[PDB]
């Protein structure tokens, strides 16, 4: 709910696990998905440093 | 990592160099091959006299 101004952007951090951007990629309102270095349909086979 | 459509022109990189570094070493040998029968000719010579 409570979002941050871009003058001010923060970061997080993602540790070990099993995502799957499978979910991550169901419909939406996202009107830009671009990924440009890995193409967006094998992102789900391979481990991220 | 990435699809047929698109790694299509990060091969014809590779293979554009790596097939003229092959033309070279057979040139060169076949340079290198022609002093050899120059000398197992005066070798021949200088054994039936």
Redesign the interface.
């Given at each position: 709910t409570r979002f941050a101004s871009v003058y001010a952007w923060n970061r997080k951090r993602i540790s070990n696990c099993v995502a799957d951007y499978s979910v991550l990629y169901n419909s939406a309102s996202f009107s830009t998905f671009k990924c440009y270095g890995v193409s967006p349909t094998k992102l789900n086979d391979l481990c991220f440093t | 990592?990435?699809?047929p459509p698109?790694a299509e022109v990060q091969i014809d990189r590779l293979i554009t160099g790596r097939l003229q570094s092959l033309q070279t070493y057979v040139t060169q040998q076949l340079i290198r091959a022609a002093e050899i029968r120059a000398s197992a000719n005066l070798a021949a010579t200088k054994m039936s006299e």
């Open positions: - | 990592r990435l699809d698109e």
